[PDB]
Motif scaffolding. Sequence first.
Motif, PDB file in Angstrom:
ATOM      1  N   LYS A   8      -2.519  -4.071  14.812  1.00 30.43           N
ATOM      2  CA  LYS A   8      -1.432  -3.118  14.448  1.00 30.43           C
ATOM      3  C   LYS A   8      -1.206  -2.137  15.599  1.00 30.43           C
ATOM      4  CE  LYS A   8      -3.899  -3.408  10.148  1.00 30.43           C
ATOM      5  NZ  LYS A   8      -3.397  -3.525   8.750  1.00 30.43           N
ATOM      6  N   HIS A   9      -0.271  -1.238  15.451  1.00 36.68           N
ATOM      7  CA  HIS A   9      -0.003  -0.256  16.539  1.00 36.68           C
ATOM      8  C   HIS A   9      -1.105   0.804  16.558  1.00 36.68           C
ATOM      9  CE1 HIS A   9       3.899  -2.085  16.913  1.00 36.68           C
ATOM     10  NE2 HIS A   9       4.059  -2.042  15.588  1.00 36.68           N
ATOM     11  N   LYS A  10      -1.549   1.191  17.722  1.00 34.33           N
ATOM     12  CA  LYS A  10      -2.612   2.231  17.806  1.00 34.33           C
ATOM     13  C   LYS A  10      -1.948   3.607  17.868  1.00 34.33           C
ATOM     14  CE  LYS A  10      -6.841   0.264  19.587  1.00 34.33           C
ATOM     15  NZ  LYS A  10      -8.103   0.959  19.969  1.00 34.33           N
ATOM     16  N   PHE A  11      -1.052   3.876  16.955  1.00 35.78           N
ATOM     17  CA  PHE A  11      -0.350   5.191  16.950  1.00 35.78           C
ATOM     18  C   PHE A  11      -1.337   6.311  17.280  1.00 35.78           C
ATOM     19  CE2 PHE A  11       2.059   2.580  13.810  1.00 35.78           C
ATOM     20  CZ  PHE A  11       3.142   2.361  14.673  1.00 35.78           C
ATOM     21  N   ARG A  12      -0.936   7.236  18.109  1.00 31.84           N
ATOM     22  CA  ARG A  12      -1.845   8.358  18.474  1.00 31.84           C
ATOM     23  C   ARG A  12      -1.014   9.620  18.710  1.00 31.84           C
ATOM     24  NH1 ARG A  12      -6.878   7.491  22.592  1.00 31.84           N
ATOM     25  NH2 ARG A  12      -8.385   8.581  21.307  1.00 31.84           N
ATOM     26  N   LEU A  13      -1.110  10.579  17.832  1.00 28.89           N
ATOM     27  CA  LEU A  13      -0.324  11.830  18.009  1.00 28.89           C
ATOM     28  C   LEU A  13      -0.556  12.376  19.419  1.00 28.89           C
ATOM     29  CD1 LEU A  13      -2.598  14.425  16.296  1.00 28.89           C
ATOM     30  CD2 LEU A  13      -3.151  12.267  17.426  1.00 28.89           C
ATOM     31  N   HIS A  14       0.496  12.651  20.136  1.00 28.03           N
ATOM     32  CA  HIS A  14       0.339  13.181  21.520  1.00 28.03           C
ATOM     33  C   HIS A  14       0.586  14.690  21.521  1.00 28.03           C
ATOM     34  CE1 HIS A  14       0.011  10.057  24.794  1.00 28.03           C
ATOM     35  NE2 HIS A  14      -0.697  11.094  25.248  1.00 28.03           N
ATOM     36  N   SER A  15       0.515  15.310  22.667  1.00 22.83           N
ATOM     37  CA  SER A  15       0.740  16.781  22.731  1.00 22.83           C
ATOM     38  C   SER A  15       1.551  17.130  23.982  1.00 22.83           C
ATOM     39  CB  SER A  15      -0.608  17.499  22.784  1.00 22.83           C
ATOM     40  OG  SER A  15      -1.493  16.905  21.843  1.00 22.83           O
ATOM     41  N   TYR A  16       2.680  16.502  24.174  1.00 21.30           N
ATOM     42  CA  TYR A  16       3.505  16.816  25.375  1.00 21.30           C
ATOM     43  C   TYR A  16       4.009  18.257  25.272  1.00 21.30           C
ATOM     44  CZ  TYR A  16       3.652  11.970  23.952  1.00 21.30           C
ATOM     45  OH  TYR A  16       3.317  10.719  23.474  1.00 21.30           O
ATOM     46  N   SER A  17       4.868  18.519  24.324  1.00 20.46           N
ATOM     47  CA  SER A  17       5.406  19.897  24.157  1.00 20.46           C
ATOM     48  C   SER A  17       6.403  19.902  22.997  1.00 20.46           C
ATOM     49  CB  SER A  17       6.115  20.330  25.441  1.00 20.46           C
ATOM     50  OG  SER A  17       7.137  21.265  25.121  1.00 20.46           O
ATOM     51  N   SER A  18       7.110  18.821  22.813  1.00 24.92           N
ATOM     52  CA  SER A  18       8.096  18.747  21.699  1.00 24.92           C
ATOM     53  C   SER A  18       7.989  17.377  21.027  1.00 24.92           C
ATOM     54  CB  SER A  18       9.508  18.933  22.255  1.00 24.92           C
ATOM     55  OG  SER A  18       9.763  20.320  22.438  1.00 24.92           O
ATOM     56  N   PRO A  19       8.522  17.283  19.837  1.00 24.04           N
ATOM     57  CA  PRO A  19       8.502  16.036  19.058  1.00 24.04           C
ATOM     58  C   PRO A  19       9.556  15.059  19.584  1.00 24.04           C
ATOM     59  CG  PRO A  19       9.559  17.852  17.770  1.00 24.04           C
ATOM     60  CD  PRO A  19       9.193  18.412  19.158  1.00 24.04           C
ATOM     61  N   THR A  20       9.192  13.814  19.742  1.00 29.78           N
ATOM     62  CA  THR A  20      10.166  12.809  20.250  1.00 29.78           C
ATOM     63  C   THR A  20      10.909  12.192  19.067  1.00 29.78           C
ATOM     64  OG1 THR A  20       8.243  12.262  21.595  1.00 29.78           O
ATOM     65  CG2 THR A  20      10.318  11.148  22.112  1.00 29.78           C
ATOM     66  N   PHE A  21      11.860  11.343  19.329  1.00 30.49           N
ATOM     67  CA  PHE A  21      12.622  10.719  18.211  1.00 30.49           C
ATOM     68  C   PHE A  21      11.801   9.583  17.600  1.00 30.49           C
ATOM     69  CE2 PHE A  21      16.671  12.821  18.861  1.00 30.49           C
ATOM     70  CZ  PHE A  21      16.433  13.407  20.112  1.00 30.49           C
ATOM     71  N   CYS A  22      12.129   9.190  16.399  1.00 31.62           N
ATOM     72  CA  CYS A  22      11.371   8.092  15.736  1.00 31.62           C
ATOM     73  C   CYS A  22      12.142   6.778  15.893  1.00 31.62           C
ATOM     74  CB  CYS A  22      11.201   8.431  14.256  1.00 31.62           C
ATOM     75  SG  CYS A  22      10.336   7.091  13.405  1.00 31.62           S
ATOM     76  N   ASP A  23      11.442   5.697  16.092  1.00 31.77           N
ATOM     77  CA  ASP A  23      12.129   4.381  16.273  1.00 31.77           C
ATOM     78  C   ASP A  23      12.235   3.648  14.935  1.00 31.77           C
ATOM     79  OD1 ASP A  23       9.627   3.164  15.656  1.00 31.77           O
ATOM     80  OD2 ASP A  23       9.007   3.747  17.635  1.00 31.77           O
ATOM     81  N   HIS A  24      11.463   4.044  13.965  1.00 32.49           N
ATOM     82  CA  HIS A  24      11.518   3.360  12.643  1.00 32.49           C
ATOM     83  C   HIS A  24      12.578   4.027  11.762  1.00 32.49           C
ATOM     84  CE1 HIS A  24      10.099   1.388   8.969  1.00 32.49           C
ATOM     85  NE2 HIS A  24      10.520   2.501   8.363  1.00 32.49           N
ATOM     86  N   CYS A  25      12.839   5.289  11.969  1.00 33.53           N
ATOM     87  CA  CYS A  25      13.868   5.975  11.134  1.00 33.53           C
ATOM     88  C   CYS A  25      14.919   6.623  12.039  1.00 33.53           C
ATOM     89  CB  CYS A  25      13.198   7.048  10.272  1.00 33.53           C
ATOM     90  SG  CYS A  25      12.362   8.247  11.337  1.00 33.53           S
ATOM     91  N   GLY A  26      14.731   6.559  13.330  1.00 28.57           N
ATOM     92  CA  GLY A  26      15.726   7.168  14.258  1.00 28.57           C
ATOM     93  C   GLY A  26      15.917   8.647  13.915  1.00 28.57           C
ATOM     94  N   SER A  27      14.847   9.388  13.834  1.00 25.69           N
ATOM     95  CA  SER A  27      14.966  10.837  13.505  1.00 25.69           C
ATOM     96  C   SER A  27      13.916  11.625  14.289  1.00 25.69           C
ATOM     97  CB  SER A  27      14.742  11.039  12.006  1.00 25.69           C
ATOM     98  OG  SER A  27      15.520  10.095  11.282  1.00 25.69           O
ATOM     99  N   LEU A  28      14.261  12.793  14.758  1.00 27.40           N
ATOM    100  CA  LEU A  28      13.278  13.605  15.531  1.00 27.40           C
ATOM    101  C   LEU A  28      12.075  13.939  14.649  1.00 27.40           C
ATOM    102  CD1 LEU A  28      15.631  15.742  17.636  1.00 27.40           C
ATOM    103  CD2 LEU A  28      13.452  14.824  18.449  1.00 27.40           C
ATOM    104  N   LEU A  29      10.893  13.763  15.166  1.00 24.75           N
ATOM    105  CA  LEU A  29       9.674  14.073  14.370  1.00 24.75           C
ATOM    106  C   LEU A  29       9.533  15.590  14.234  1.00 24.75           C
ATOM    107  CD1 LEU A  29       7.921  11.743  16.772  1.00 24.75           C
ATOM    108  CD2 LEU A  29       8.265  11.119  14.381  1.00 24.75           C
ATOM    109  N   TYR A  30      10.087  16.156  13.196  1.00 23.07           N
ATOM    110  CA  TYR A  30       9.988  17.631  13.010  1.00 23.07           C
ATOM    111  C   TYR A  30       8.529  18.068  13.153  1.00 23.07           C
ATOM    112  CZ  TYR A  30      14.785  17.556  11.486  1.00 23.07           C
ATOM    113  OH  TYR A  30      16.157  17.413  11.442  1.00 23.07           O
ATOM    114  N   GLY A  31       8.261  19.334  12.990  1.00 23.01           N
ATOM    115  CA  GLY A  31       6.858  19.821  13.114  1.00 23.01           C
ATOM    116  C   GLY A  31       5.976  19.110  12.086  1.00 23.01           C
ATOM    117  N   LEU A  32       6.577  18.473  11.117  1.00 28.10           N
ATOM    118  CA  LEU A  32       5.775  17.760  10.083  1.00 28.10           C
ATOM    119  C   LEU A  32       4.633  16.995  10.757  1.00 28.10           C
ATOM    120  CD1 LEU A  32       8.544  16.586   7.687  1.00 28.10           C
ATOM    121  CD2 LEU A  32       6.576  18.041   7.183  1.00 28.10           C
ATOM    122  N   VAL A  33       4.809  16.614  11.992  1.00 35.92           N
ATOM    123  CA  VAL A  33       3.734  15.865  12.701  1.00 35.92           C
ATOM    124  C   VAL A  33       3.591  16.406  14.123  1.00 35.92           C
ATOM    125  CG1 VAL A  33       4.120  13.806  11.338  1.00 35.92           C
ATOM    126  CG2 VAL A  33       5.479  14.218  13.393  1.00 35.92           C
TER     127      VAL A  33
END
Length: 66
Positions: A8-33
């Motif tokens: 499966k995908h090794k999803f790993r929360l990163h810490s660049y500076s801002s939330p990137t867009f989502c490819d499964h729902c096409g929506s910016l990852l609000y602070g929720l994550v």
Amino acid sequence: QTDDPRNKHKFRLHSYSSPTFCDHCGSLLYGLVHQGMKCSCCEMNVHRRCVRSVPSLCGVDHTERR
Ligand SMILES: [Zn+2]
Ligand SMILES: [Zn+2]
């Protein structure tokens, strides 16, 4: 413990500076994550509740038609 089907995908929360867009729902990852979940295998940003929706399509791309 031979059984270990972790393809499966090794999803790993990163810490660049801002939330990137989502490819499964096409929506910016609000602070929720904290930022976005980047897959440490194929580079896939998704939400924390969108992974349960994806059928773990990591390492299963495919082969060109040549
Ligand atoms: Zn992946
Ligand atoms: Zn999403």
